[PDB]
């Protein structure tokens, strides 16, 4: 009855007793530096705890992945606990999600509602593979970041895979948006300053599910009722005017995406089945992400939208 992400975050906060302190510091940095897209840069995470910096600046800091685990989860939870958004994608939509068109602008992934969203795609039956160890992907966090490749600050989108395991690898995977380049350019042809490739292919795979939160006209429902993108970007966290402290949600806001569409598809399949149950002497054309460019006003833009499933009878 309590989501696994919340349970694991609550566990972390308990086991690393300095967690609440670090979030407050992050909050302080946020309010002062007023970042436009991110909430708190990953780079700055050594500052939050002094013991972590002391153990991270020994030879063995970038070698110890447990410290990087701590820092990654501080960076992630600190941004995520202010909104606690969980977006469950519908079956009949997850299936039709395949890789996006390769010239989609990165810029459209600057349109997330919150600083960090958790996307639930366990109905995709996608797994993650590492050295003989295969793990089912329950979901993933998309969280913003501001990074410094020296002298320059870029807008990066980080992905954190959730496999619901004790040894989950929470180390964020970056995907630079600040460039004018499309998804293909960055991810595919290695133009990014991040060239790890395994991470880049993993990100590309994640992209088609994350797109729903960046569309101008989302099928988001909260508890069965439509959410306008206007209402979705409304603030959740409350800031105290005298103290400066943050008031955060006690429970997550679990949304559903593509549920009208899913129901429609379920009903189409129901007609097919009914026809086959009465045997008298009728198919679904699957939906898909569709990309195109209006290319008007001289400014070149690439538009992607969901082309829905269609009952062909």
């Amino acid at each position: 009855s309590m989501h696994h992400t919340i349970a694991r975050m609550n566990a972390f906060n308990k086991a690393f007793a300095n967690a609440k302190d670090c979030y407050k510091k992050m909050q302080a940095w946020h309010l002062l530096n007023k970042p436009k897209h991110a909430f708190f840069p990953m780079q700055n995470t050594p500052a939050l705890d002094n013991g972590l910096a002391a153990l991270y600046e020994l030879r063995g800091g970038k070698e110890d992945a447990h410290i990087l685990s701590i820092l990654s989860r501080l960076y992630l939870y600190g941004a995520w606990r202010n909104t606690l958004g969980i977006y469950q994608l519908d079956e009949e939509i997850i299936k039709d999600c395949k890789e996006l068109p390769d010239d989609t602008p990165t810029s459209i992934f600057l349109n997330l509602p919150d600083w960090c969203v958790y996307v639930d795609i366990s109905s995709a039956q996608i797994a993650t593979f590492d050295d003989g160890v295969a793990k089912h992907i329950k979901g993933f966090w998309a969280i913003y970041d501001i990074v410094e490749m020296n002298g320059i600050n870029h807008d990066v989108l980080d992905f954190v895979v959730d496999t619901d395991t004790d040894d989950n690898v929470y180390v964020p995977q970056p995907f630079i948006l600040s460039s004018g380049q499309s998804v293909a350019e960055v991810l595919d042809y290695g133009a990014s300053l991040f060239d790890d490739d395994t991470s880049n292919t993993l990100i590309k795979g994640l992209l088609p599910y994350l797109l729903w939160l960046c569309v101008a006209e989302p099928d988001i429902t909260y508890k069965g009722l439509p959410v306008s993108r206007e209402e979705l970007t409304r603030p959740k966290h409350s800031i105290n005017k005298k103290t400066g402290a943050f008031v955060t949600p006690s429970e997550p806001f679990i949304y559903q995406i593509g549920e009208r569409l899913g129901s429609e598809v379920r009903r189409y399949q129901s007609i097919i089945d009914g026809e086959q149950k009465r045997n008298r002497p009728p198919h679904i054309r699957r939906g898909h992400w569709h990309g195109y460019w209006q290319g008007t006003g001289q400014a070149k833009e690439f538009r992607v939208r969901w082309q829905p499933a269609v009952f062909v009878n």
Partner: peptide
């Protein structure tokens, strides 16, 4: 258990890129 995962993605690295 035969109804299962059919897609594999490369597991994320446990390091952060230089920077």
């Amino acid at each position: 258990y035969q109804k299962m995962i059919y897609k594999l993605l490369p597991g994320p690295n446990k390091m952060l890129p230089k920077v």
